[PDB]
Amino acid sequence: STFIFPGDSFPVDPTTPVKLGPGIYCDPNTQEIRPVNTGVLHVSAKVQTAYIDYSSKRYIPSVNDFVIGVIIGTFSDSYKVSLQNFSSSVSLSYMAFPNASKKNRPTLQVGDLVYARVCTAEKELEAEIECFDSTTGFGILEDGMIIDVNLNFARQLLFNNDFPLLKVLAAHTKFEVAIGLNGKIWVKCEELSNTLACYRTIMECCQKNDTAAFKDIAKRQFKEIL
């Protein structure tokens, strides 16, 4: 894991078969593999997977990502969903639900929060999400509060089980959390005082980037709610 800047020489040799992840770009003209994002370049061992971890707040739809959207419009056969403000809209088909039929259409209305997975994310087409499992927790997120978070904090919260945020929050209250890889984290508790205390802790922990400070922040926020 080394730090890399855009335009720098790519360390990996063409003789090794590599699957390219985020941050690495393959020139359509020169066929050279070069970085376009600034961050830490991670390379696997043995089939080698290489990518760059870079900081960003604007989400870009990619397949097999868990995202939270909001219904902003109802069309003929799909829903117009927004995964982030000012970003391009996303399509959610009516048939993209469990036990879907041409006789029963989904009951979602404009303004409802939906937790879904990205299925088709063509760069030249409207992205699409689905509320049914690709291999067979999705659906409407009733009430609660949504939290704005940078994409690196959201990826670390969903995939790294050593991330202490979920542990220090369970140690204070019983809470339901839905983690979206587009920077939206949904939280709901039994009482409004607990949901707000989870909002304030996630907001402050997102700003520090220091993992070793999550426990002290949670202790003072729930103390202020009391």
Partner: peptide
């Protein structure tokens, strides 16, 4: 098999 929506503090 990574979980996304889960209730904590059971």
């Amino acid at each position: 098999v990574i979980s996304g929506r889960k209730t904590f503090g059971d």
